[PDB]
Amino acid sequence: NLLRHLKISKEQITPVVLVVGDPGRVDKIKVVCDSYVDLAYNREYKSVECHYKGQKFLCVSHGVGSAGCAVCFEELCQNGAKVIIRAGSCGSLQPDLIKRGDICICNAAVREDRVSHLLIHGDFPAVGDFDVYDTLNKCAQELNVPVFNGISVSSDMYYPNKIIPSRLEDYSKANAAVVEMELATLMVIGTLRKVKTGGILIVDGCPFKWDEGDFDNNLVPHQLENMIKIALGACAKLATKYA
Amino acid sequence: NLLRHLKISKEQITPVVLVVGDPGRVDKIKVVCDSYVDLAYNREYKSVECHYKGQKFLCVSHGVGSAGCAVCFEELCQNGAKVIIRAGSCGSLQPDLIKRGDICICNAAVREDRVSHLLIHGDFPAVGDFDVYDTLNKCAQELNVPVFNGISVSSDMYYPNKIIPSRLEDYSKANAAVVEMELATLMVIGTLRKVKTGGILIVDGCPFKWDEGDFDNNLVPHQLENMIKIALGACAKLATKYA
Amino acid sequence: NLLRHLKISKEQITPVVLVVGDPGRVDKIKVVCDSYVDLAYNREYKSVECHYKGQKFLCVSHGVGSAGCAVCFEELCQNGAKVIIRAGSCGSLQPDLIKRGDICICNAAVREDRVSHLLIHGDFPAVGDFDVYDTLNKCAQELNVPVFNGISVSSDMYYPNKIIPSRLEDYSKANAAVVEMELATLMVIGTLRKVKTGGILIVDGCPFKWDEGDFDNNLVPHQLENMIKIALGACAKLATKYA
Amino acid sequence: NLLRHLKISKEQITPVVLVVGDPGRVDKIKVVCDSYVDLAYNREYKSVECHYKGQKFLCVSHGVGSAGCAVCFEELCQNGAKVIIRAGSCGSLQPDLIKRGDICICNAAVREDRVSHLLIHGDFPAVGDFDVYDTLNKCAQELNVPVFNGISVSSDMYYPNKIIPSRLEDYSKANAAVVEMELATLMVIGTLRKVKTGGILIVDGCPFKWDEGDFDNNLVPHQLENMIKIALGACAKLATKYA
Amino acid sequence: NLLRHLKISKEQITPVVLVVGDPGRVDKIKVVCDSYVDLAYNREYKSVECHYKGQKFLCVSHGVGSAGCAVCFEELCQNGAKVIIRAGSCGSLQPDLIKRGDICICNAAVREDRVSHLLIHGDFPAVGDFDVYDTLNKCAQELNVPVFNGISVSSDMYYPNKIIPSRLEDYSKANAAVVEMELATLMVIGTLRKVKTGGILIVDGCPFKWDEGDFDNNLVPHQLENMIKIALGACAKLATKYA
Amino acid sequence: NLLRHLKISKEQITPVVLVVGDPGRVDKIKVVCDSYVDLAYNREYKSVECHYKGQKFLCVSHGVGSAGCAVCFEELCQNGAKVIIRAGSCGSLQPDLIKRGDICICNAAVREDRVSHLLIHGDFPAVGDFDVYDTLNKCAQELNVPVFNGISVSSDMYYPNKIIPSRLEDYSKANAAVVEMELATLMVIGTLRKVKTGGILIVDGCPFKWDEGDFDNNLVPHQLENMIKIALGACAKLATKYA
Numbered sequence A, B, C, D, E, F: 001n002l003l004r005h006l007k008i009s010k011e012q013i014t015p016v017v018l019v020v021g022d023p024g025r026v027d028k029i030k031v032v033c034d035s036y037v038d039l040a041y042n043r044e045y046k047s048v049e050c051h052y053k054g055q056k057f058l059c060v061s062h063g064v065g066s067a068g069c070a071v072c073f074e075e076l077c078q079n080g081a082k083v084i085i086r087a088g089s090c091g092s093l094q095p096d097l098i099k100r101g102d103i104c105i106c107n108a109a110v111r112e113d114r115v116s117h118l119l120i121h122g123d124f125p126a127v128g129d130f131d132v133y134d135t136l137n138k139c140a141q142e143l144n145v146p147v148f149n150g151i152s153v154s155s156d157m158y159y160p161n162k163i164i165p166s167r168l169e170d171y172s173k174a175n176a177a178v179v180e181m182e183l184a185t186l187m188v189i190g191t192l193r194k195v196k197t198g199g200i201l202i203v204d205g206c207p208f209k210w211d212e213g214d215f216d217n218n219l220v221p222h223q224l225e226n227m228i229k230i231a232l233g234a235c236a237k238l239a240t241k242y243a
């Protein structure tokens, strides 16, 4: 019996799952694996079974935004998933240090969403599993891929208006490294559901400089590949522990 | 250039736009019109130009969740859209009155999201445009399609937990009619950017009884058809004026 | 027995009720009707039965402020009232477009009070009934009286301080049309008590320019008379339907 | 130069001012003084200069509710008033100890309004001036009138609904003595404007027992007489000091 | 049986207790009394039974901070204490009037802590007992020591950052007189536990001018002695009553 | 000059610091090190330079409560500290798995304080540094000391009351491991000041079973000894990175 919105069965769910926001990215990633098996595609949720380094793990798209990815995350977590790693893009909150193309492996996030709050009080931290976190950094090292580490601001607001000030600058001063829209939700759902989570992101611009055109419609080819290698490598290594 | 994430151009945006959640729903709607022209399909945002009753209007999918649909709505509102109508599914909060298949035309909504709050203080109301509301009702009447009218709870939480209590029962007692995940965001964004909004929904179950099987993976055919006719009819009438 | 604070019996309550802020305004209004019957006068709550176009409906003063009018509204809603229309004065939040004398028929409001929050969560919208809004607009048409439509900011703070910044500016940018002190409370109570509500206001100045003398201790003669015609006309139309 | 809503000049404002909720109560009080001079009556605000023991001080009605009384209090504080004492009715939050007829002199209050919050952060205390509190108690002492002392809950909600629970039971457990609707607002405005405030109240019932009829529409005559004696005595003594 | 953290038995607790922040201060106080008896010293909590003017009362240190002092206060309140007077240092929020070495007796405080909020809603006031307040002022008058009276801001943040603005300026404008870190917590716990509280503080600088070196590592010698005399004098007077 | 409250100079602060709550604890710790140098003891803040396994690092007591420890943490972070590890006691929030004497190395915390909120928005996470977390775990491993890992609830309330429900059960359900009073504050301050933090705690009871006598007057001897060895070992390892 398929999951309400992912449209896959519990038996099709592997212990390690790699989630991305763009359903089209799932097709781009499956092709770089040793082999793959398409499972389903419903709404913005595309699921494919990946095979990498003799290891097996799913790759599912969660779509844009916290409320949307929460549906995906909850279905994965409540049906077998043990490790969920989000791989996506992000904006730099430190323009003088982190730039387009750079990779950042995050261990925690700012809960600027609503669903995590509807799940647990705001004082609760949005934090990833440090073993998952460690696995990601090690894979990066072994591949000789320099990366940044830090906190990501997960905000439900992509396009700000001019009435209520955005908190991005505050968080930049607070030393948050990047900003995206799903990590915190994944992390909180993960801890509440005893699922190990992690996150690796690649910068595609800086929201502080969008007016000056500091935004790339497309990610830096070379680096996107490196990040995916890191991500796949990690999932493989982590999967080995449940095989 | 094209809209950053919708991947359509400014000149391709019609004054009137029909938005739905499932990108697949867009293809099912375009084939009911007299003719159409596929525009783009990026992530969960599928855009198509619809031709119905001599009128021209777009149909765009916004995806699941307030943060994701916010990306879609902002691009549309900041690039020419004058009227946006959301057509989707919802759950009944008045099970003894509103049942599966029933249709509800909502005039306002509960802002249980975060993005709208990041845009304007919570005391501000999520309310639709009367003209659009009235147009939708006048079309249902002409088609002899009975509908309900009321407030929708737009909540970011689809799958509740056992720690923090859901506010759905409170809102039911407060006389809210249904519950879905995007209307309040559409409304507030519309108001802030001077875009007229409206919404028509079809009940697919009751959240108070999911644990009892009250959920249709498939919507009621005739009802869904009648809702789309109303939706399409409403868009045609409004488009005429702007034409 | 009599309503605790209105000092009128339940049987003296008509399905349609017109409420104003100033108890003295009730006298100024009872005169222009065909005839009337004074019911009571307790504190700032003055009740009178009005006879207009062969229709019976009460006119009750509610006083200044959300907490005060809430007492009035609850006693009415819980004892027979089916429709309540507030007619009063307001300040303009769009000075370049809305000026002294202008009439605005509002469909929703900003809940900047406390009592509505003590009744239901802040995410809940303060929105009036569509028929009442429609009825009021049409009556304005019939009488060839140009009127604005929009959202009203209902704030418990009339005289601002210099420590905590007023939110009026924010709301003006958010496109709120006018500002008064009781509409949101009326709307929420009505929605909760299944009572259709509506509001029509006359501009007596702009709070952004009070330091410039932009305030009329006396409302515009013809304009006020016109608004009153509209209100009475609307009450008449609605009372007929309930008979 | 009349005050916008009180309709009196800054010249008619005495340093000490006695405020009551009911404009009718002002008349019942002025005739118990040596002499009086009616000043004005607008909306629910009736002003009268009271003469007592050779002392001159005003008695003004402020209406029901924090938002409404705030207009009164600001106009008075911003135009001369140096001392403001509120004399009114209240409900008992300690049914086994405080009953109908009993008098309570309050030194502080719970800010369950909105206007005090729009003026200053919530953490700020609603507290009366010790001097006024002390004089009121001493006057009660001299007249041999027993009285309670304690905290009053100033809540904007008089008639509660059944969705959001009331905080009255919580405050009763916290040892709040009484409940009314204007004291917290007077205290905060007083502190902010450098005006000494105080409040004396007579119990008319218990909200926990309204369903039992524990509410007297009429205040115990003798008790009310004694309270006003205490109030007028205090106003005279304080008036002397400011002479 | 000994209290968990104060390490004294319930029988050793006197009806009146003088509390100070620094355990070192306890020792400096006991020697100024007629005679004393050391009870215990655990963590930062030092207890000593003081004998003064033929009266008996304890002097206990509560440490720096609301959370830390709450532990001390609860153990005292839940085990026999009837009166608790805090004597400590503070910063001036009115640099034009209250200078270093000046003494302020406070009647209420701003609740900028967390513990009091975990105990009761924020709207509840942090207010001291009148009798204790009055006793402190009378002892000051008898000793011919001029003192200020006013509200204290009890803030958990001593060293502010540059991201979130400090509320001290707002409170100075709201007329708060001084700032320290434990009074509000004492007051709220006292009210809840029916224990009479008070506070007397000596100014050690002004947080608005720390960058100008406006801070005394050592309190004004004579002033500190004067304050302690007032403090001990008050405890003696209040202790007599329970004796 | 000296730090205002720690009373040590900037030059006396080592890059790595070990903080504990009880000042008496640093004397019990310094004695197990190779040698030490007492620096100062002011209020509840005792500082001693420890020499262990060829490295030098300070051991400083911070007292009970977040507000108090923030003073200590801020003085250290703004004056040279690069690594701060907290070693203290805690309560078990999972009494069926974590019992008296068990050791828990925490990587994140619940911000149930106030000071962290006065420094940065609540959505920000309280999370420790991975290097520190990893070092602590590796040291426990080397010493064959089993330990738990998890989130700690840092709450300013030690003794709850019966009015406002404690959120501990909620956090237990959310899978928080233990509860104490200072970790979250240390974490947030460190993230903001660019200082690496960590925490290791020994369980001395369970808040859910205090009434049934589930409290440890004294920490389990051999377990406390082991945790101290782990903490001292971690500090030395981290210190070498700055030697």
Ligand SMILES: CSC[C@H]1[NH2+][C@@H](c2c[nH]c3c(=O)[nH]cnc23)[C@H](O)[C@@H]1O
Pocket: A021, A063, A064, A065, A088, A089, A090, A091, A092, A158, A179, A180, A181, A182, A204, A205, A206, A207, B005, B071
């Ligand atoms: C508008 S859809 C953008 C997606 N890409 C990520 C993202 C990249 N750059 C930025 C940025 O600058 N701000 C906020 N989100 C993103 C977010 O997590 C969304 O899933």
Ligand SMILES: CSC[C@H]1[NH2+][C@@H](c2c[nH]c3c(=O)[nH]cnc23)[C@H](O)[C@@H]1O
Pocket: A005, A071, B021, B063, B064, B065, B088, B089, B090, B091, B092, B158, B179, B180, B181, B182, B204, B205, B206, B207
């Ligand atoms: C999680 S996918 C559900 C979508 N369908 C709508 C919906 C239908 N029924 C319900 C319900 O019972 N609760 C919340 N949302 C919905 C929402 O707007 C989402 O876009």
Ligand SMILES: CSC[C@H]1[NH2+][C@@H](c2c[nH]c3c(=O)[nH]cnc23)[C@H](O)[C@@H]1O
Pocket: C021, C063, C064, C065, C088, C089, C090, C091, C092, C158, C179, C180, C181, C182, C204, C205, C206, C207, D005, D071
């Ligand atoms: C406080 S007395 C003013 C009354 N008239 C209305 C009003 C008119 N103009 C304004 C304004 O500029 N600000 C706030 N309220 C009003 C409010 O609803 C009150 O009942």
Ligand SMILES: CSC[C@H]1[NH2+][C@@H](c2c[nH]c3c(=O)[nH]cnc23)[C@H](O)[C@@H]1O
Pocket: C005, C071, D021, D063, D064, D065, D088, D089, D090, D091, D092, D158, D179, D180, D181, D182, D204, D205, D206, D207
């Ligand atoms: C509804 S008008 C009641 C007025 N009398 C006072 C009052 C008396 N008894 C109670 C009670 O039980 N609850 C709340 N307010 C009051 C309040 O301060 C209002 O000005």
Ligand SMILES: CSC[C@H]1[NH2+][C@@H](c2c[nH]c3c(=O)[nH]cnc23)[C@H](O)[C@@H]1O
Pocket: E021, E063, E064, E065, E088, E089, E090, E091, E092, E158, E179, E180, E181, E182, E204, E205, E206, E207, F005, F071
């Ligand atoms: C941070 S240690 C300072 C202690 N002395 C008091 C204090 C003196 N001056 C000030 C000030 O300017 N701001 C905040 N607290 C204090 C507080 O109540 C603490 O217990």
Ligand SMILES: CSC[C@H]1[NH2+][C@@H](c2c[nH]c3c(=O)[nH]cnc23)[C@H](O)[C@@H]1O
Pocket: E005, E071, F021, F063, F064, F065, F088, F089, F090, F091, F092, F158, F179, F180, F181, F182, F204, F205, F206, F207
């Ligand atoms: C109030 S003395 C308790 C100290 N020991 C720690 C502690 C041990 N057990 C518990 C508990 O069950 N709840 C809260 N704190 C603690 C806290 O961090 C304080 O510094």
